[PDB]
Amino acid sequence: ASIRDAGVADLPGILAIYNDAVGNTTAIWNETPVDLANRQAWFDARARQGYPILVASDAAGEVLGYASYGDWRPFEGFRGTVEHSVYVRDDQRGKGLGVQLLQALIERARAQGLHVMVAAIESGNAASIGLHRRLGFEISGQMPQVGQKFGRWLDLTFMQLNLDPTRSAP
Structure with a gap:
């Protein structure tokens, strides 16, 4: 897959x-669906921030x-850190696409001079944690019952990858 x-034409597919x-998943902790105008706004906002949206x-x-990926936390002091999200279409799972998309984001982030990429994973997703691990991420946080979905508490696992370890200062 390429x-x-x-592009704007990819928004209805997205x-x-x-x-x-x-x-239907715990991959995203929102329960309300959005419309096209909502994604168009998200598309433009990412553009002004210089953050990529890969397909x-x-x-x-x-x-x-x-x-x-976009801001991890909304303060100037975290500008060297971003948080990502990856979604694969349901008839397309089990084909290694998630890894392909994440690796591409890491390359764009590194190229932009960013320092750290953060991942927020529902703690019960053992496979997702294993995949991030193989890519260089390390667990840096385990926070009990900070989330919820479908009527139950959810645990969150934070993982991070230092994009440029030899950079002693910003």
Whole structure:
């Protein structure tokens, strides 16, 4: 699959994947679906911040998956740190796309001179933690019952990857 920046024409495909995640998974901790205007606003905001929105596709040109990153925390002191999110279309799982999209984000982040990429993972997702681990992430936080979905408390696991370890200062 090819990976590249998203265009406005990829937004309805992205919308479908997203609304789908929020109502049937613990991958996204929102329960309310959004509309196209909402994603168009998100698309423009990422553009002003210089943050990428990547799309996995092929010859057919359909959105098989997407990924992006943005502010981890809203303060000037965290500008060297970003948090990512990756989503694969449901008929496309088990094909290694998630790893492809995450690796692409890491390359864009590194190229932009960012220092750390953070991952927030539902603690029960052992496979997701294992995949992030193989890519260089290390667990830096384990926070009990800070979230909730489908009527139950959720635990969050924080993982991080230092994009440039030899950089003694910003």
